[PDB]
DNA sequence: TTTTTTTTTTTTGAGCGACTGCACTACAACGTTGTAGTGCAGTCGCTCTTTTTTTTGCTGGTGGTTTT
């Protein structure tokens, strides 16, 4: 199902992504997680925020 | 295939046009001489702007910097 989350800032969207990750876990542990980004810098900032939120940011692809 | 020395600067404006001095003949005043007009040459001032006009792909799209 296609889901669009309207928000004013990206911190609430990162909290929603954290809630989706902690709610629904992947069946395969080595299955990659695709996070579509605008650029490499936004991918690095999202990896920084996911490392600060989860404690670990690994096996996450930013295509 | 190897390798040596070394510390002195220079030069540069020219054509256009006038000022002044000396020679040179034409002609009228008193055969000869003084004044006037022009030619030629040495010397010298002067003077040489202003300015601005543009398209280029931010990531146009299997793209993306950096660690063992």
Curated annotation (Swiss-Prot):
UniProt remark on domains: The holoenzyme may undergo conformational shifts upon DNA binding: the nuclease domain of RecB may swing away from the DNA exit tunnel in RecC. When Chi DNA binds to the RecC tunnel, the nuclease domain may then swing back to its original position (that seen in crystal structures), allowing it to nick the DNA 3' of the Chi site and then rotate to load RecA. At high Mg(2+) the nuclease domain may swing back more frequently, explaining differences seen in assays performed at high Mg(2+).
Note: In the RecBCD complex, RecB has a slow 3'-5' helicase, an exonuclease activity and loads RecA onto ssDNA, RecD has a fast 5'-3' helicase activity while RecC stimulates the ATPase and processivity of the RecB helicase and contributes to recognition of the Chi site.
Transmembrane regions: none
Portion of the full-length sequence here: 1 to 63 of 1122
Name of the featured protein: RecBCD enzyme subunit RecC
Superkingdom, natural source: Bacteria
Record function comment: A helicase/nuclease that prepares dsDNA breaks (DSB) for recombinational DNA repair. Binds to DSBs and unwinds DNA via a rapid (>1 kb/second) and highly processive (>30 kb) ATP-dependent bidirectional helicase. Unwinds dsDNA until it encounters a Chi (crossover hotspot instigator, 5'-GCTGGTGG-3') sequence from the 3' direction. Cuts ssDNA a few nucleotides 3' to Chi site, by nicking one strand or switching the strand degraded (depending on the reaction conditions). The properties and activities of the enzyme are changed at Chi.
Impact after mutating residue 38 to A: Acts at variant Chi sequences
Lineage: Bacteria, Pseudomonadati, Pseudomonadota, Gammaproteobacteria, Enterobacterales
Stated family: Belongs to the RecC family.
Self-association and partners: Heterotrimer of RecB, RecC and RecD. All subunits contribute to DNA-binding. Interacts with YgbT (Cas1).
Phenotype upon loss of function: Decreased degradation of DNA with free ends that is unable to undergo homologous recombination, which can fortuitously lead to more efficient viral infection. Cells are deficient in DNA recombination repair and have increased sensitivity to UV light. The cultures have many inviable cells. Cells can be transformed with retron Ec48-containing plasmids.
Coiled-coil region: none
Species of provenance: Escherichia coli (strain K12)
């Amino acid at each position: 199902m296609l889901r669009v989350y309207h928000s004013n800032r990206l911190d609430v969207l990162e909290a929603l992504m954290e809630f989706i990750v902690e709610r629904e876990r992947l069946d395969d542990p080595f299955e990659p997680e695709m996070i579509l980004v605008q650029s490499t810098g936004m991918a690095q900032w999202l990896q920084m925020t996911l490392s600060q939120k989860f404690g670990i940011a690994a096996n996450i692809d930013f295509p």
